[PDB]
């Protein structure tokens, strides 16, 4: 992948035009490389979404509602 990409990027130095087979091979290698480093995010709960009564929430714990992104601003520095 790296070699084909840099070859495509440095061919113009010698003023030559790439062939379709080279382009296809470079595309295939790049697609494989992108497939390797692939991550798909998962959408977590909004934060005000209620938790059902079947989960048996309790006080002293924040289990009543789904834990969203905490603000992480506490003390005097928030204000």
């Amino acid at each position: 992948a790296v070699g084909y990409q840099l070859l495509l990027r440095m061919l113009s130095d010698y003023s030559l035009e790439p062939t379709p087979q080279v382009l296809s091979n470079a595309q295939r290698s790049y697609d494989a490389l992108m497939t390797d480093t692939l991550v798909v995010p998962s959408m977590r709960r909004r934060g005000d979404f209620p938790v059902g009564q079947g989960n048996k929430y309790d006080v002293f714990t924040s289990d009543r509602y789904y834990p969203g992104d905490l603000p992480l601003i506490d003390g005097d520095i928030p204000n």
């Binding site: 003390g75 005097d76 520095i77 204000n79």
Partner: protein, 53 residues
């Protein structure tokens, strides 16, 4: 107790330091006896001492 206040443009006091709580007291004590004493002989009260009260 006495206190002092800060002054910030947005209410942010992270860098600065807070007030302390120093306690002081006033102590009083007892003084010395105020004693007055007199004495006299038996014969002085027998003859001389009149209107002792």
């Amino acid at each position: 107790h006495q206190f002092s206040s800060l002054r910030t443009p947005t209410g942010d006091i992270s860098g600065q330091n807070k007030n302390n709580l120093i306690s002081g007291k006033a102590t009083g004590r007892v003084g010395n006896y105020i004693t007055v004493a007199v004495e006299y002989q038996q014969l002085e009260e027998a003859i001389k001492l009149n209107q002792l009260e």
